[PDB]
Design a binder for this molecule. Structure first.
Ligand SMILES: COc1cc2cc(C(=O)CCC(=O)O)sc2cc1OCCCOc1cc2sc(C(=O)CCC(=O)O)cc2cc1OC
Lengths: 174, 177
């Protein structure tokens, strides 16, 4: 299926390559570039409506860009020093900073959105929500077999609303 | 299907975002960063599509006649909460009988490695023998998408092959423009 392949590719082609190196990048930030410490783990936003905006402070003013984590580079598929950039956000609650974390959307969910827009994709809008849930479920299943990746990320699946409160609820468990 | 979604995602999530900005990056390289005495880096991203789904990280390892020259200047863009998400691409010299025969931006379509990995992992529910058919479907879907996106189709070339000289495969495509 479409979402089954997308989740396997998101893991093989991305998470598997950044998650084993993430702890060291956060530790390095907290020691030399950082206010309280940035939390560990990549917080992955999984909007089931497949709406992936480019700016997070636009989705919620209580999510404020703080800094970029130091870049990871690696030779990848003929791309010498392929760069992996990730962003740190402050999470506000009633004007106070309530958490700090590395946050981003799972970009393959935007593929489901675009395929439901384009006739040639042969993918209906009526099948999109089921595919979004299957993408999240497959990703959860893969991570359950990859400890080095599972402990370095948190999956934030939601249907619409306060995005910062959704992230904070997950953050307040570690 | 798996390869149908992978090709749509490779386009939506990557090619659609880099191909409209590629010509300017190559022009900028040729004008300010290219060794003054060398010929211009060719236009277009040359995308390697090995139907065996073998995606090595080092190209000079796959063929010594493919030699790393330089990185193209980076493209940055705010993407899905990643402020200044970086797109890096590499320039290669293609040698023929010890001489330079071509210079181009070259890389493998990384979703083909997903097909390889899925054919290995039992939880992926992807049989080992399904690889080739899925790799061909990935290439055919990518060709179909690009045929509807002129701003992308003119900025890339698809190099699909079954094994051998990888440099000769690239040169054959290069020698048409
Ligand atoms: C190779 O497969 C995948 C690679 C991949 C890379 C990703 C990211 O860098 C996350 C941020 C972003 O999407 O820009 S998210 C991501 C997800 C992947 O699998 C989903 C299905 C295929 O769709 C995409 C293909 C690519 S290739 C690419 C590159 O930067 C080329 C170099 C490389 O693979 O490291 C980005 C994508 C994104 C895809 O879907 C969103």
């Amino acid at each position: 299926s479409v979402a089954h392949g997308l989740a396997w590719s998101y893991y093989i082609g991305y998470l598997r390559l950044i998650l084993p190196e993430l702890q060291a990048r956060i530790r390095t930030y907290n020691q030399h570039y950082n206010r309280g410490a940035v939390s560990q783990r990549l917080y992955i936003l999984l909007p089931l409506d497949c709406g992936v905006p480019d700016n997070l402070s636009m989705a919620d003013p209580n999510i404020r860009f703080l800094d970029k984590l130091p870049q990871q580079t690696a030779d990848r598929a003929g791309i010498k020093d392929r760069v992996y950039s990730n962003s740190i956000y402050e999470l506000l609650e009633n004007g106070q900073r309530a958490g700090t974390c590395v946050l981003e959307y799972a970009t393959p969910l935007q593929t489901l959105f675009a395929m439901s827009q384009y006739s040639q994709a042969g993918f209906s809008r009526e099948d999109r929500l089921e595919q979004a849930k299957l993408f999240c479920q497959t990703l959860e299943d893969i991570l359950a077999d990859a400890p080095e990746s599972q402990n370095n990320c948190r999956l934030i699946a939601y249907q619409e609303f306060s995005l910062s409160q959704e992230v904070l609820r997950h953050l307040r468990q570690e």
